[PDB]
Design a protein around this ligand. Structure first.
Ligand SMILES: *[C@@H]1O[C@H](CO)[C@@H](O[C@@H]2O[C@H](CO)[C@@H](O[C@@H]3O[C@H](CO)[C@@H](O)[C@H](O)[C@@H]3O)[C@H](O)[C@H]2NC(C)=O)[C@H](O)[C@H]1NC(C)=O
Ligand SMILES: *[C@@H]1O[C@H](CO)[C@@H](O[C@@H]2O[C@H](CO)[C@@H](O[C@@H]3O[C@H](CO)[C@@H](O)[C@H](O)[C@@H]3O)[C@H](O)[C@H]2NC(C)=O)[C@H](O)[C@H]1NC(C)=O
Ligand SMILES: *[C@@H]1O[C@H](CO)[C@@H](O)[C@H](O)[C@H]1NC(C)=O
Ligand SMILES: *[C@@H]1O[C@H](CO)[C@@H](O)[C@H](O)[C@H]1NC(C)=O
Lengths: 189, 193
């Protein structure tokens, strides 16, 4: 009868090797979450500008930045499937800020989810589960209305965000609770 | 100050005087200072000083320290002082932030180092923290904290261009305001008045 105010929903449609995607993830989405996580519900969709083709009964993917991007996309899809939400977010952010992403999977996992082996993540990423997860991200990305014009494509309560630097301000404004995080009142107009 | 004939605007200087096990210190470090840096690092110069409310005593030729949260806090303070001495600035900042958000900090030193400074072994850091270098580094942090004018009334004690910051939630807004450059990070114009 009197539920708490709902969090602001943010969706990121991205690809692992897109420069603007990595900047927004690490220097916009992640720090905003660190500041106002209590009023934020983030969804990550690694697929971006990839393309998918049914080749002999199974889905195959082509990525704008090559096979490494397609493989890293599937690694992160498997992280989102096998880890708790916060652990997967932190591990993916950890990787995306690194020069050699594939080779930091183990170290980032050891920090945020040491109970999950990197080998089990790679088995998913190179196996049928990773292909199934990537196909689901393909369908989600294709269902965008309007379709995405570029990556990163950011939705805030299902509406496309045109200026990513406004993320923190818009999340604070859209939150319906009267008691906001202290940062929201500092940046308020 | 260089270049000297048309130099770029200087960054905003931020100092954090803290102790490793203080709850308000860890929140401010991980959920205020770190994300502000992630947003506007280009206009920020951050200094970390691990010591906080610790106390210092010369007992028979060597400095010994007592921490409000016990021996574990004193040991973690010296680990982070040694990190600041042995790693590059950004790597030390990232490693310390990585540790301070964890439940078992001592056991995350190795893992956090493997992410941000794999060339530095945790064994070499622990040798420093438990050796003469860690004691000398901690004594230097004691002197810096004691030199605060005005003296700190609590931790975390945050200085923005050498002035105490009383509302930590205003950090991002104040850093953006104090920066003298005409071209600011895009976030600064979004939160601008
Ligand atoms: C943050 O966003 C996600 C996705 O919007 C939320 O997860 C979703 O939570 C709802 C529950 O209201 C799930 O809907 C369905 O609920 C019925 C029970 O009424 C249940 O029988 C169904 O099996 C299903 O769970 C929805 O599936 C679920 N979506 C996903 C991908 O898990 C989440 O609740 C939000 N978190 C917060 C704190 O708001
Ligand atoms: C961020 O803040 C620190 C501390 O204010 C700055 O480091 C300091 O940089 C100056 C030189 O730029 C050093 O002082 C001078 O060094 C020269 C040698 O280059 C010497 O001839 C002078 O007599 C004087 O000693 C100073 O050692 C150094 N202080 C510390 C604690 O490292 C740093 O430059 C700032 N980073 C920026 C603005 O990007
Ligand atoms: C992909 O190939 C096989 C049919 O041989 C099957 O899994 C599925 O129906 C096909 N999907 C599409 C869109 O053709
Ligand atoms: C600490 O104690 C020693 C005694 O061996 C004394 O000589 C020295 O002056 C003290 N060090 C200081 C005050 O820095």
């Amino acid at each position: 009868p009197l539920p708490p105010s709902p969090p602001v929903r943010v969706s990121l449609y991205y690809e692992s090797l897109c420069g603007a995607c990595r900047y927004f993830l690490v220097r916009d989405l992640f720090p905003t979450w660190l500041m106002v996580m209590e009023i934020m519900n983030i969804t990550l969709v690694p697929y971006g500008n990839a393309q998918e083709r049914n080749v002999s009964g199974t889905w195959e993917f082509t990525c704008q930045h090559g096979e490494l991007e397609c493989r890293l996309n599937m690694v992160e899809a498997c992280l989102l499937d096998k880890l708790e939400k916060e652990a997967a977010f932190l591990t993916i952010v950890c990787m995306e800020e690194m020069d050699d992403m594939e080779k930091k999977l183990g170290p980032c996992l050891q920090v945020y989810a040491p109970e999950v082996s990197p080998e089990s993540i790679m088995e998913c990423a190179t196996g049928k589960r990773g292909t199934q997860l990537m196909h689901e991200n393909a369908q989600l990305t294709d269902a965008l209305h309007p379709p995405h014009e570029y990556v990163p494509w950011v939705l805030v309560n299902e509406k496309p965000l045109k200026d990513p630097s406004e993320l923190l301000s818009i999340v604070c404004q859209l939150y319906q609770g009267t008691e906001k995080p202290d940062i929201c009142s500092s940046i308020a107009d």
